Design a protein around this ligand. Structure first.
Ligand SMILES: *[C@@H]1O[C@H](CO)[C@@H](O[C@@H]2O[C@H](CO)[C@@H](O[C@H]3O[C@H](CO)[C@@H](O)[C@H](O[C@H]4O[C@H](CO)[C@@H](O)[C@H](O)[C@@H]4O)[C@@H]3O)[C@H](O)[C@H]2NC(C)=O)[C@H](O)[C@H]1NC(C)=O
Ligand SMILES: *[C@@H]1O[C@H](CO)[C@@H](O[C@@H]2O[C@H](CO)[C@@H](O[C@H]3O[C@H](CO)[C@@H](O)[C@H](O[C@H]4O[C@H](CO)[C@@H](O)[C@H](O)[C@@H]4O)[C@@H]3O)[C@H](O)[C@H]2NC(C)=O)[C@H](O)[C@H]1NC(C)=O
Ligand SMILES: *[C@@H]1O[C@H](CO)[C@@H](O[C@@H]2O[C@H](CO)[C@@H](O[C@H]3O[C@H](CO)[C@@H](O)[C@H](O[C@H]4O[C@H](CO)[C@@H](O)[C@H](O)[C@@H]4O)[C@@H]3O)[C@H](O)[C@H]2NC(C)=O)[C@H](O)[C@H]1NC(C)=O
Ligand SMILES: *[C@@H]1O[C@H](CO)[C@@H](O[C@@H]2O[C@H](CO)[C@@H](O[C@H]3O[C@H](CO)[C@@H](O)[C@H](O[C@H]4O[C@H](CO)[C@@H](O)[C@H](O)[C@@H]4O)[C@@H]3O)[C@H](O)[C@H]2NC(C)=O)[C@H](O)[C@H]1NC(C)=O
Ligand SMILES: *[C@@H]1O[C@H](CO)[C@@H](O[C@@H]2O[C@H](CO)[C@@H](O[C@H]3O[C@H](CO)[C@@H](O)[C@H](O[C@H]4O[C@H](CO)[C@@H](O)[C@H](O)[C@@H]4O)[C@@H]3O)[C@H](O)[C@H]2NC(C)=O)[C@H](O)[C@H]1NC(C)=O
Ligand SMILES: *[C@@H]1O[C@H](CO)[C@@H](O[C@@H]2O[C@H](CO)[C@@H](O[C@H]3O[C@H](CO)[C@@H](O)[C@H](O)[C@@H]3O)[C@H](O)[C@H]2NC(C)=O)[C@H](O)[C@H]1NC(C)=O
Ligand SMILES: *[C@@H]1O[C@H](CO)[C@@H](O[C@@H]2O[C@H](CO)[C@@H](O[C@H]3O[C@H](CO)[C@@H](O)[C@H](O)[C@@H]3O)[C@H](O)[C@H]2NC(C)=O)[C@H](O)[C@H]1NC(C)=O
Ligand SMILES: *[C@@H]1O[C@H](CO)[C@@H](O[C@@H]2O[C@H](CO)[C@@H](O[C@H]3O[C@H](CO)[C@@H](O)[C@H](O)[C@@H]3O)[C@H](O)[C@H]2NC(C)=O)[C@H](O)[C@H]1NC(C)=O
Ligand SMILES: *[C@@H]1O[C@H](CO)[C@@H](O[C@@H]2O[C@H](CO)[C@@H](O)[C@H](O)[C@H]2NC(C)=O)[C@H](O)[C@H]1NC(C)=O
Ligand SMILES: *[C@@H]1O[C@H](CO)[C@@H](O[C@@H]2O[C@H](CO)[C@@H](O)[C@H](O)[C@H]2NC(C)=O)[C@H](O)[C@H]1NC(C)=O
Ligand SMILES: *[C@@H]1O[C@H](CO)[C@@H](O[C@@H]2O[C@H](CO)[C@@H](O)[C@H](O)[C@H]2NC(C)=O)[C@H](O)[C@H]1NC(C)=O
Ligand SMILES: *[C@@H]1O[C@H](CO)[C@@H](O[C@@H]2O[C@H](CO)[C@@H](O)[C@H](O)[C@H]2NC(C)=O)[C@H](O)[C@H]1NC(C)=O
Ligand SMILES: *[C@@H]1O[C@H](CO)[C@@H](O[C@@H]2O[C@H](CO)[C@@H](O)[C@H](O)[C@H]2NC(C)=O)[C@H](O)[C@H]1NC(C)=O
Ligand SMILES: *[C@@H]1O[C@H](CO)[C@@H](O)[C@H](O)[C@H]1NC(C)=O
Ligand SMILES: *[C@@H]1O[C@H](CO)[C@@H](O)[C@H](O)[C@H]1NC(C)=O
Ligand SMILES: *[C@@H]1O[C@H](CO)[C@@H](O)[C@H](O)[C@H]1NC(C)=O
Ligand SMILES: *[C@@H]1O[C@H](CO)[C@@H](O)[C@H](O)[C@H]1NC(C)=O
Ligand SMILES: *[C@@H]1O[C@H](CO)[C@@H](O)[C@H](O)[C@H]1NC(C)=O
Lengths: 491, 481, 491
């Protein structure tokens, strides 16, 4: 049997003693300590302090836990007379030539009318008057047979009336046309001017109506942009505040964890103090009011007397004990197996003086003889095995899963799409250029002066006072006289 | 005297003992533990890791706690009335003479039948005169009357033509003056219209360009606001879970700290066991191993102390009738250091742990004055915490809550702007038609030829002129001598 | 020697005992308790409970901890006269005056002809006809000289034929001038009318184009402002929700701290209950079984017997002990120094009769004599000084920096700048006023064909008197004077 219960070992048994006085101090209570969370967490920060009021009454709940702890020639000579011929006077000129006696010989036949020019030179006037007078004179002499010379007087007069009427007829038709065209043209121009005037009025009304529409739109747009700008500024200021408070809230939460551990460690320490107060209670009853047989309880050594003494937050004991002065090792065995019967001492140890065995108290060397009423006897020599694991309570720690798995249960991952606004850069509002037309109108207005009729040029009775024949002789005679003198002048 | 102090009862008193060895393990210390809070809370998540940085140094504080643990043009057509009266008879020419302000007129047309009638009238007067006294010439009157009337008719017609020519020319000059005056007004109005419509067009282009930049600025700001809002909404969701997971970390630390407090208590017990059993012999019953103590041997452990207690335990025991005290003749007797035991007829004092009955004597027992008992209660209650007590969430929220609801943003409705359109197509079509139709108002005169006749000298003047040339020439020839 | 080990103080030793019974109650377990975190923090607020759902499964972890407890020459030479029609008529009237008989004496001469107006009143017709009739009648009687009174009949008509001839040509010339000027004016007016019509057509198209460009802009702007308002309303609604939820998250975090202390204090109480269960285990082991020598352990007084009992969550002991009935104080010393050597008892105290010294048990006054087997003797009288400072663990509380120092490490302070939209109030879109031009056009459209009041007479009365031949020979002789000067130069 090589068990620890029979094999002997050397232990030191005291032989001489000395007195010791042991001062033992045991806390029994702790000071009541509060904590203001505003100073602990924020302190001097005003932003933190304002946000902390929204966190509730956690401070008074934490303090509650801590509180409970405690051629060159003709032009020169003859006067020129122009006539408007309707188509017969030119042939009359070929008829006549110069001979005035052929005035009636060939009168032109115009569209069935025998016509003659209205012109009557002095040669013809004398000829016709002489014919008229000769007929009247000779009628009486010849019993009226000599009246036939009055016929050319009448025939020429009637023919000239036809010749005057023929050209007068076209003059009247021309004047009727000129008057009718002038009235019609003025009528058409009046229509155009009224049309232009009404068109301009319709243009002005629309241009001004669109001018008010643009002005109204611009004024309304400015109000809309003012309202949008003011709303945007408020949103940005609110957004800035929220983003600041969120970061501050993160630090407040993180510092709340440190405050929580500070409270927890204070509560745990109070529990340890309460256990120390329980120990001081037993020490007061077991050491002050009695004598303890337990070694090192009530001071190191073996108890004699103890004296309590108060402390500010604890209790102080002055244990009077006797401790060993000198000791020597002795060969001791817990039990000895004598022929299969284990013997062990009751209240003692088996000490050996080298040869025999003895029973002595554990705290003093005083060998005694082993007697029947000094030791117990066991039937067998075997031993009983027991195991005692004084384990402390193993806590059930949290079993958190992955952060992503916990987040995915209720997370709302959202992304706002970009604001898409219509593009108005394609609006043209083109311009107009009509300067060429305006220049044309101003040019025609200036040029319309040239179409004015000169009233001084209309009734123009042109007349040249040609030289009479008797001065032509004098001019010729004088011209000859003014050169014959030069004959003598040269020499 | 019915108390439990005097009534006897049966208990088991050991009679034989056997050696036992008890191995007792006592933790005295704990391994140092450090918690990685980023790994504990976030782990592999990156959004949590960046957000957890803003919570401060709580991880160091937790680790510190755990580390320490270890006279317105009309009226000239009197030919119409003359033609109607005449009836194409050629003899009523003189009878059908019209009038004009007392001037009898006849048209200047004389057909060959009329000419014969008037000439024969002229001829008849000349012949008949004389042969019928002087009264015969009266047939010459119609010849003179018709010619004089035709002279008046020509003079009247030429008068109305000149008057109408004067009227048309005078009217034309004044009409032209007015027209070119209205052309300047048309050109002036068009110049003013063009300037305004061009100025308005440039105003629209300027407004459109400015609006596009304003809408570009608004869109960029709104996109930035939306991006910031999406970040904030996601972050407040994440730090809700971080705050909730911080509670699990706190309980993890708290339970580690409480376990350390228990270990410290177990370290104190191991120190007590070492003093009272390794260095002494214990009189306590099962302190330091089951059964009564004999010897103990300490042994080191990785984080504790292992005790090899050698004790002796009862092997066989038999039940005995015992009483804590015995009331004899009014005085209670109780043993000092023992218990009363009964053999069946007598009483003895024996040790509580071994049956070795002894005779009751004065030195074995104590005597009390009376037989009453003293009643006491020891209520060893544990500390009852002052748990937090909170109000309702509703009445703790409205103390500082700010219930806000932004009113809907409204903007002025601009859909009422009209910008009406113009339609002057009727006037433009009229102007183009009149411009095209003014050609028909051109005057196409009936052309009259121009004949020019010289009034030549009469032959008798020509003869005289030649005679004058002859006379002057002969005088010059006389001077030439 | 002045220490407490030789103090000679006085203590009270029992001399008479009385049976006592002590009922000791020890808790050994806690009831199974769990916390409803949603009810604990929110209670009945739906907004809190919805937000608390996102805080994770902390409730399960907390309950896990709690559960585990339980014509380169003509111009140059001849005088030129050009009168008007009105002047000729006025001149003729000056001749005639009122006497309708001087028609022939001053008949005008024009361009070599003799002219008279083509008008005969009834007086002139009577005068000429009576002239013609007289010439015919008297011709026979007067023997030819009576026919002389017939020339004025012939002369008057020939004069009037010539006068008509020259006045028809001028009338045609007036028509030619009027027609030519009228046709030229019509062409110019045609050009201005087409130019006006084209200018109006360009203006109308541009005005209509601008109006359509404005309308499409207005329609697009309204849609853009509709999109802006809808996105702004959504942002505002999102902002209100975030700000409300931020405040609620603050109160939830604060209330989580108090719940954490509730769990912590429950866990600490369990540790104390487990400690009390250990004490009950030793009490059952040392009082119920076996007799304890520890005073006041296993009930007040000195242990006799104990009887266990069952409790709902604990154990009840019925400790039978004997307590001191009466006791008298006694003068005693822990040890008496004799002959320089300390004397202390073996498991007792040194009581004194007042004259001698005795050894007695601490719990009973039964004095005995002092022998070598009743006491110990030390070598010297000195005492050993020892101190046992039973300090409880001092936790390492958190050491936080200032809030500002911790916040500035990762703070992202940022204020969004104010928005500044462009100003569009400077757009005028001016209006037009052409009412004067429209009024002038509409007036001319009415006054164009109005008849004049002061028609101006046609023609002119200019006279171009040229040099007579009197100075023409003088001019020729002046050339001869140049000739004779050259002759004088030669000679
Ligand atoms: C007195 O009782 C105490 C309380 O039970 C015992 O402490 C326990 O010891 C065991 C064994 O070491 C330990 O179990 C775990 O220990 C390790 C923790 O991770 C781990 O390695 C262990 O796994 C082992 O066992 C399994 C099962 O076969 C094998 O698959 C593995 O390969 C490995 O071998 C095991 O999980 C306890 O944790 C520990 N308790 C505490 C609270 O720490 C004492 O050992 C006991 N003493 C005696 C002398 O009996
Ligand atoms: C519980 O234990 C009690 C204490 O031991 C017993 O009482 C004792 O019993 C013994 C034995 O009978 C007795 O001893 C003597 O009794 C007589 C004198 O008192 C005397 O006559 C006896 O002598 C007889 O027995 C011996 C034994 O060998 C013989 O030699 C003699 O020849 C003779 O036969 C004996 O010496 C005690 O006196 C007695 N005590 C008292 C106080 O009376 C109880 O009996 C016991 N109970 C039970 C139920 O066993
Ligand atoms: C040892 O100390 C323990 C801790 O103090 C005591 O337990 C206490 O027991 C009392 C009752 O005796 C109990 O008080 C409350 O218990 C209930 C919880 O609210 C409640 O029902 C009780 O109501 C009482 O009063 C009303 C009206 O008067 C009666 O109708 C009830 O019947 C009842 O009497 C009372 O409010 C403590 O809570 C409880 N404490 C603990 C921690 O459990 C032991 O009683 C004490 N033992 C001895 C022997 O002294
Ligand atoms: C504290 O205890 C001390 C130790 O007991 C006491 O000392 C003892 O005192 C007694 C009483 O006097 C004494 O007993 C004997 O003393 C004498 C022999 O030494 C002897 O003469 C005495 O006999 C006397 O008294 C009896 C009784 O009346 C008479 O019959 C005699 O005739 C005679 O008068 C007596 O037998 C002890 O010897 C003595 N011890 C020592 C060591 O001296 C203290 O007195 C005591 N103190 C107090 C204050 O009580
Ligand atoms: C048993 O152990 C206890 C725990 O260690 C001891 O109490 C400790 O005592 C010290 C010393 O006083 C104390 O430290 C601080 O105490 C004061 C804090 O309020 C402070 O005044 C002290 O300042 C001291 O030291 C500085 C620098 O060294 C000097 O300038 C001062 O003049 C002064 O000397 C010091 O900071 C511990 O706080 C205190 N602990 C506890 C838990 O109370 C007991 O003294 C000890 N008992 C014995 C008998 O040894
Ligand atoms: C919320 O949804 C977000 C949607 O944009 C998402 O951000 C983006 O996530 C994708 C997918 O993980 C990332 O894409 C990158 O990763 C893939 C995976 O291998 C690779 O092909 C490339 O690396 C690719 O770039 C985006 O980078 C990421 N965007 C940003 C800005 O990080 C968020 O992850 C979602 N949030 C949560 C909490 O789940
Ligand atoms: C403070 O903010 C609260 C959150 O927006 C807001 O809650 C709203 O409360 C009203 C009633 O006060 C609810 O209206 C409901 O009323 C009854 C409830 O039984 C129903 O019959 C109605 O149909 C209606 O649902 C709102 O629904 C509720 N709003 C939300 C978003 O939940 C409070 O009103 C705010 N306080 C003030 C003074 O305005
Ligand atoms: C984030 O930055 C902010 C500026 O962008 C800052 O707000 C400004 O803080 C300064 C002081 O740092 C204030 O200055 C004022 O100081 C005292 C306190 O009122 C006054 O007596 C002075 O006259 C002076 O005005 C600014 O007024 C203040 N600006 C605003 C708009 O409030 C924040 O403090 C910064 N936040 C953090 C958490 O650091
Ligand atoms: C057309 O001719 C008239 C005259 O008949 C011009 O009128 C003259 O205008 C000038 C300035 O241009 C003035 O100094 C004169 O006094 C005006 N004269 C008269 C008589 O009124 C007229 O200007 C001409 N038209 C244009 C467009 O120039
Ligand atoms: C004395 O002797 C034995 C023990 O030695 C007792 O037997 C016990 O009886 C109780 C009755 O409740 C049982 O629960 C135990 O299991 C028994 N123990 C054994 C070891 O068998 C017996 O009851 C006692 N006799 C008297 C009269 O008290
Ligand atoms: C008036 O008549 C002239 C002469 O015919 C027209 O001139 C013609 O105009 C047409 C249409 O523009 C052209 O195709 C011809 O080539 C032109 N001919 C000549 C000879 O110029 C003139 O347009 C007419 N005015 C109108 C229609 O308003
Ligand atoms: C003498 O013993 C008596 C008891 O028998 C003690 O008397 C009591 O002492 C306590 C503690 O000081 C006081 O509170 C009581 O008031 C005392 N009782 C009486 C009735 O006075 C006494 O203290 C002891 N003497 C000494 C010196 O300790
Ligand atoms: C000048 O022209 C005007 C144009 O308004 C003529 O006035 C109109 O003439 C028409 C002829 O049919 C009448 O029916 C209208 O009643 C007249 N008045 C208006 C206001 O339109 C006017 O008659 C013309 N004058 C001349 C002399 O021809
Ligand atoms: C052990 O039991 C036996 C049974 O016969 C008995 O005789 C003996 O006395 C007992 N031993 C002790 C030490 O009591
Ligand atoms: C508007 O009028 C202001 C003066 O009032 C001028 O300076 C500016 O150019 C004008 N703008 C437009 C677009 O007409
Ligand atoms: C106890 O008091 C009684 C009287 O009540 C007395 O006779 C007795 O002696 C006292 N006890 C002791 C041990 O002195
Ligand atoms: C101690 O007190 C006792 C009381 O009996 C007395 O005899 C002794 O002389 C005292 N000793 C000292 C040193 O005071
Ligand atoms: C204790 O010490 C003393 C003084 O030195 C000595 O005489 C005595 O023998 C010692 N005691 C024992 C038991 O050896």
């Amino acid at each position: 049997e090589n068990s620890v219960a029979y094999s002997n070992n050397s232990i030191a048994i005291p032989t001489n003693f000395t007195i010791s006085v042991t001062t033992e101090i045991l806390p029994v209570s702790m000071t009541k300590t509060s904590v203001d969370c505003t100073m602990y967490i924020c302190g001097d920060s005003t932003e933190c302090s304002n946000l902390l009021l929204q966190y509730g009454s956690f401070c008074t709940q934490l303090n509650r836990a801590l509180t409970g702890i405690a051629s060159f020639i003709e032009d020169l000579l003859f006067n020129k007379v122009t006539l408007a011929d309707a188509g017969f006077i030119k042939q009359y000129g070929d008829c006549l030539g110069d001979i005035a006696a052929r005035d009636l010989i060939c009168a032109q036949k115009f569209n069935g009318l025998t016509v003659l020019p209205p012109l009557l030179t002095d040669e013809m006037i004398a000829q016709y008057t002489s014919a008229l007078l000769a007929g009247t004179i000779t009628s009486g002499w010849t019993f009226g047979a000599g009246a036939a010379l009055q016929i050319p007087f009448a025939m020429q007069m009637a023919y000239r009336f036809n010749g005057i009427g023929v050209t007068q007829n076209v003059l009247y038709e021309n004047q009727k046309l000129i008057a009718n065209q002038f009235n019609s043209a003025i009528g058409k121009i009046q229509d155009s001017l009224s049309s232009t005037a009404s068109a301009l009025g319709k243009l002005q009304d629309v241009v001004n109506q669109n001018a008010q529409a643009l002005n109204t739109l611009v004024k309304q747009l400015s109000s809309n942009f003012g309202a949008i700008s003011s709303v945007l500024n408020d949103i940005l200021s609110r957004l800035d505040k929220v983003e600041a408070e969120v970061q501050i809230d993160r630090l407040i939460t993180g510092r709340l964890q440190s405050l929580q551990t500070y409270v927890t460690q204070q509560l745990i320490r109070a529990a340890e103090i309460r256990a120390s107060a329980n120990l001081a209670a037993t020490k007061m009853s077991e050491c002050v009011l009695g004598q303890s047989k337990r070694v090192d309880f009530c001071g190191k050594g073996y108890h004699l007397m103890s004296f309590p003494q108060s402390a500010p937050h604890g209790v102080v004991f002055l244990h009077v004990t006797y401790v060993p002065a000198q000791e020597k090792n002795f060969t001791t065995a817990p039990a000895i197996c004598h022929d299969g019967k284990a013997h062990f001492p009751r209240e003692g140890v088996f000490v050996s003086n080298g040869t025999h065995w003895f029973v002595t108290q554990r705290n003093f060397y005083e060998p005694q003889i082993i007697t029947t009423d000094n030791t117990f006897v066991s039937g067998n020599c075997d031993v009983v095995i027991g195991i005692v694991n004084n384990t402390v309570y193993d806590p059930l720690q949290p079993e958190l899963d992955s952060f992503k798995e916990e987040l995915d249960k209720y997370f709302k991952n959202h992304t706002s799409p970009d604001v898409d606004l219509g593009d108005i850069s394609g609006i043209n509002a083109s311009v107009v250029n009509i300067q060429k037309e305006i220049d044309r109108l101003n040019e025609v207005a200036k040029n319309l002066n040239e179409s004015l009729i000169d009233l001084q040029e209309l009734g123009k009775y042109e007349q040249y006072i040609k030289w009479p024949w008797y001065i032509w002789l004098g001019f010729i005679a004088g011209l000859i006289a003014i050169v014959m003198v030069t004959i003598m002048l040269c020499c």
